[PDB]
Ligand binder design. Structure first.
Ligand SMILES: Cc1ncc(COP(=O)(O)O)c(C=O)c1O
Ligand SMILES: Cc1ncc(COP(=O)(O)O)c(C=O)c1O
Ligand SMILES: [Cl-]
Ligand SMILES: [Cl-]
Lengths: 348, 349
């Protein structure tokens, strides 16, 4: 039962469909052999966009882009492209802090809100100033298990790292001005990073941008200004095809809110363990819980027993400590329930 | 089917097969595309992949091996940001060298000490490397024009080289190079990873301005996993190195490639429907460009459609040079080269 935090569990169909490492419709040639300038690859790029557009209900005026280099690279690109004079951020955890520290290296960043004080266990109240160039959030804070589940109304363009909770439920794209997400958690395999960007926001920055970091260039060249990560992109295509096949994001959410409901319920009733985050702000993707009072013991005791019973990748981040159950889309109800019983049977 | 694609390109079958890890990498039971990059399983493969690379290419101590996303094209920026303190010098031997220059120029003062532009990049120009510049950048094999610098250069200033098209195509004295980078998708493995071998000594000499994600020093410190790397692409590199080693290492590779090129250049020369575009001396062993002779006999359809019919793919040239281009990287076999030879020959009207 893989609760890995990213890369993570993946729907079998999607891993199997990637039999295109063996024969893609070249004909006869591996997907890893085919030219990205081939009409065969171009179709797949268009097809993947079309589907993404369909699945996420992306309105006209937004462009879809596939980049290597991970979300971490995007921390820089959003800043270089949209931080003209001043930008504002919301510090809800490690990834958010990383985003900020990058932005701070390119221009003036104002952190309007921070949950640092109480160790990132909650999502802080904040006010978005209307005179800043853009507002950046981190929808789901993968390490702490906090999440902003409602789409936000900004007056300034909204930018959101959804690495951990993109494609986990339906959303109003029209509120976001730039969404980006490493593929490796919910979208697909590592090695590609997705950017859905409202092209309108772009050319407003004073002048200083390298060609390779310039959203406008990539857009111009249909995300193939240079050689994209074909194989990873192909996982995204398949993953989108899967989501669609199983009722799209509406059904996805049902499965995810149930998975998260049951798991939070367990932690709450079971009194070996205690959840770390404020109920109201609980993540539906990354579920963090610690030993209860105390040390009863985390040590070895919950962990080794879990391992034995087949539960992998639930050890928490060093900073929060304790445990973390990453339950992305591909993580099944059965597995969550396997971890529920594991926790329950451990109860002494 | 004979794949002369320019990148991505032909790949050894063992390497595409080995990538059965998509189905089941160690784990146990989990796909390579599911495994954590922090896992001890993946960390071994990174180390193994470095160790092998170090072994195959004979990398001396002091040099750090790094896998990046984003292509060589990102590397165009990164070298400049990381090494261009006050002034740099570059050698314009074609499209890719030009692209490298234009990026560098966006960061700081760049001097182009040499250019083969004048005669449409058909030759490699004479040059003198100033000892006072922060680094010298070259593009060893000019993938679009079919020129190549086959001998390793002695700088004084640190040498930087885009070997996308001819890395791992023969042995080389790494000690002459200060920073090597190459997109994987031509000789090293699948697209989606870009390799960097860099002499860490050269680094911290730049004033001061570098984003975390673009900082070779940061990536070095975190063993190339500061952020999530391209697991699957990296794997293909691990396998490709394994394959190279398996077949006698770079020494044997060179033998195959030089013969492949010789035979094909020999056909182009004898056959007088076609004519090679580049000065013999500077002929690329990796990317072989030829045009119709005199003229238009006709490139048109005539050589092209017939070739397609006969199973030859990806030989159509770049728009700028026109004509044709036969990319014959490591994974391209002597059989394929000879099948294209015969096609050309039999077509002799
Ligand atoms: C919310 C969030 N943003 C960004 C990232 C960074 O992803 P990458 O490794 O592609 O930089 C992560 C990685 O886990 C994450 O959880
Ligand atoms: C010499 C050279 N440089 C740069 C590139 C660009 O690689 P990418 O598109 O991955 O940046 C190529 C691609 O073929 C190449 O042969
Ligand atoms: Cl976080
Ligand atoms: Cl070139």
């Amino acid at each position: 039962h893989n609760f890995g935090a990213g890369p993570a569990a993946m729907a079998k169909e999607v891993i199997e469909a990637t039999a295109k490492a063996v024969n893609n419709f070249w004909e006869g040639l591996s997907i890893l052999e085919i030219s990205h300038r081939s009409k065969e690859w171009i179709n797949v790029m268009n097809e993947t966009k079309a589907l993404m557009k369909e699945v996420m209900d992306i309105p006209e005026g937004y462009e879809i882009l596939f980049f290597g280099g991970g979300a971490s690279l995007q921390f820089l690109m959003v800043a270089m492209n949209l931080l003209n004079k001043k930008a504002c951020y919301l510090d809800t955890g490690v990834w958010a802090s990383k985003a900020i520290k990058e932005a701070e290296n390119i221009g003036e960043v104002k952190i309007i809100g921070t949950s640092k004080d109480k160790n990132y266990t909650y999502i802080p109240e904040y006010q978005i100033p209307s005179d800043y160039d853009y507002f950046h959030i981190t929808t789901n804070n993968t390490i702490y298990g906090t999440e902003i589940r409602k789409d936000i109304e900004s007056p300034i363009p909204l930018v959101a790292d959804m690495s951990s909770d993109i494609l986990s439920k339906p959303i109003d794209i029209s509120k976001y001005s730039l969404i980006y997400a490493g593929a490796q958690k919910n979208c697909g395999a590592a090695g590609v990073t997705i950017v859905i960007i409202k092209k309108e926001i772009l050319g407003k920055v004073q002048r200083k941008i390298p060609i390779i970091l310039d959203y406008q260039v990539h857009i111009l060249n249909n995300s193939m200004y240079n050689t994209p990560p074909v194989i990873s992109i192909f996982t995204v295509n398949q993953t989108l095809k899967y989501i669609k096949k199983i009722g799209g994001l509406k059904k996805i959410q049902e499965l995810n809110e149930e998975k998260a409901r049951l798991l939070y319920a367990e932690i709450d009733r079971n009194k070996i363990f205690r959840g770390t985050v404020r109920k109201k702000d609980r993540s539906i993707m990354n579920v963090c819980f610690v030993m209860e009072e105390q040390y009863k013991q985390l040590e070895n005791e919950f962990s080794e027993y879990a391992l034995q019973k087949g539960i992998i990748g639930i050890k928490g981040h060093r900073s929060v400590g304790g445990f973390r159950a990453s339950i992305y889309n591909a993580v099944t109800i059965e597995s969550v329930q396997a971890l529920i019983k594991c926790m329950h049977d451990f109860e002494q």
